Symmetry: D2
Subunit: 112 residues, 4 copies
Amino acid sequence: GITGTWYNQLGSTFIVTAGADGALTGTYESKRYVLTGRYDSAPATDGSGTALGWTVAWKNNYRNAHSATTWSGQYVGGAEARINTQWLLTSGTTEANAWKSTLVGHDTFTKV
Amino acid sequence: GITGTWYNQLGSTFIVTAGADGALTGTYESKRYVLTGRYDSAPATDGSGTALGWTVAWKNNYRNAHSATTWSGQYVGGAEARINTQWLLTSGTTEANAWKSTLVGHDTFTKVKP
Amino acid sequence: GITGTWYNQLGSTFIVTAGADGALTGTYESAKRYVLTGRYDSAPATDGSGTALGWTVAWKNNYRNAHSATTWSGQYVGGAEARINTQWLLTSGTTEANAWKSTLVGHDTFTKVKP
Amino acid sequence: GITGTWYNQLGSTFIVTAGADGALTGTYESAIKRYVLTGRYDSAPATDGSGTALGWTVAWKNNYRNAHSATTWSGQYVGGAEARINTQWLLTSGTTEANAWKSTLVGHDTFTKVK
Ligand SMILES: O=C(CCCC[C@@H]1SC[C@@H]2NC(=O)N[C@@H]21)Nc1ccc([N+](=O)[O-])cc1
Ligand SMILES: O=C(CCCC[C@@H]1SC[C@@H]2NC(=O)N[C@@H]21)Nc1ccc([N+](=O)[O-])cc1
Ligand SMILES: O=C(CCCC[C@@H]1SC[C@@H]2NC(=O)N[C@@H]21)Nc1ccc([N+](=O)[O-])cc1
Ligand SMILES: O=C(CCCC[C@@H]1SC[C@@H]2NC(=O)N[C@@H]21)Nc1ccc([N+](=O)[O-])cc1
């Protein structure tokens, strides 16, 4: 249920393929960046979500923010499917600025 | 300088290869699990670290914890070469338990076991 | 703005008073009451930015002790429907061996209308 | 074991009094640089070797400066000759809704009784 196009509350577009091997591969758009990650290819069937995560390093051929975001979350299936995530965005910093290297937030992705 | 075998303060083993276009691939042992991630393949040249992240889903041929961890951090080269990270570990939960789905912590990786 | 009774998406009840000096006091009931204390910016920017704040509950009261504490860090956002948007850290007391898994993280959004 | 002066890895000083029923009150200096803090701790921790859960908040306004932000530290106190308070923290800045996605920094501080 994960493969396809997803949208978050900021209007970002998360395009992903969930491979048989547990891989996530795709692109993330605020402008498009590569992502890769992993998901549980044998989730519980007890009403639990499917655990997953992915990373975008914010460099493409045109731009580079010298940073990377990881999203950690779970896919929740059904008629109103969602991927509910929390994320960590680390910027490359000097040692003096490392204490403020990392932003934290939460994104919810929907198929609509 | 990211490619290699790293260990964190818990004694976990992070074996990683960094590709020229930003890919991270390898294994993690907290009995290995696959990892994949991304890193900044052209970092600033002003002393700043190199941003990176990776994911492990905690399923292999022997175990499944129905969970995934992402590490987000930066590689710092030089005399004290290290990868400093923070991580989010999400377990698959029912909706009723979703509020407690996610653990947070911080791991520092070096080339020497603890 | 901040003073009042708030509810999060879980249906928890956050009863808070914001003192002129920057103090937050009150009670929290997660879906009996627990004591909370915290702080807020009592002279926020006047440029449309939210008001930074945070508070702590240690999960011990007369009835129960979970041996844990949550801190919520966030901002009050004035609006047609006023919000307090937070992220939180819940640390349980653990042995050293279990310290790696001591801390849950999440996010709660509060309004003065119960969902 | 919590009342007293604590120092973290950044050079900050955390001065706190732990009251009998769970109050934390004191001051935090990220080095004019002193700010009020308040929080809560578990005043009846487990007796199985587990740490003592606690949390506190600083809003970064004093009489001389206002950074329009607040940090909460959530963690546990671990006793012994080399007592420590191990924390994770969330620092929320007041922002517009458009910048709210980047409102919150996260990190970790270790406090000890010596510098
Ligand atoms: O490094 C960056 C790159 C862009 C990050 C977009 C974030 S990823 C989490 C969230 N979910 C989304 O769909 N989009 C946002 N930007 C950046 C980093 C730091 C600051 N800063 O002011 O500190 C400003 C911009
Ligand atoms: O889901 C799991 C799988 C194993 C996670 C190992 C974590 S990854 C962050 C940290 N860094 C490491 O090198 N190792 C640890 N375990 C798990 C999850 C939740 C709970 N729990 O009690 O909630 C217990 C075990
Ligand atoms: O220690 C506890 C005490 C209750 C915590 C309620 C949390 S505070 C963040 C969130 N917002 C709310 O309004 N309510 C929830 N419970 C607890 C801690 C850990 C685990 N665990 O399984 O790890 C289970 C229960
Ligand atoms: O809002 C501020 C006020 C000072 C925060 C000090 C932090 S509290 C967590 C950590 N532990 C310490 O002892 N000290 C640091 N500063 C601030 C906020 C954001 C940015 N920024 O660049 O985004 C810069 C400075």
